[PDB]
Amino acid sequence: CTHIQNLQQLLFASSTTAQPILTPWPLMKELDEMGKINSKLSTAVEEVTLE
C-alpha cells in the first residue's frame, strides 16, 4: 500500500527514465561527446574526410 500509491510518483517517475537516463545520468552528460563527437567520428569517415 505504501508502495503502490508511490508507483506513479517515485517508481514510474524513475523506472521509466532511470536506466535509460537517470541511472547513466553521469554518463548522459557525456553523451554530448557521443552524438556530437564520437558518433560524429562514425560520420568523420566522410564529413571531414571529403574535405
Binding site: L41, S42, V45
Partner: protein, 50 residues
Amino acid sequence: VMAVKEEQYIQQYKKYEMLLNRVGYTPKISHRELVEMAEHRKELDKMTKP
C-alpha cells in the same frame, strides 16, 4: 563505423600539445619583433606623412 575512425584520435593525442604550445617564446616574431618588424620602418608614416 566508429572503430574504423576510432583508430586516429587515440594516437593523435601524442601529436599536438607538445610542439605548438611551446612556440610563442622561442619565436621572437610571436610577440617581440614581428609586433614591430613593420613598426620599426613601415610606421614611418606616423612622421613621414607629416
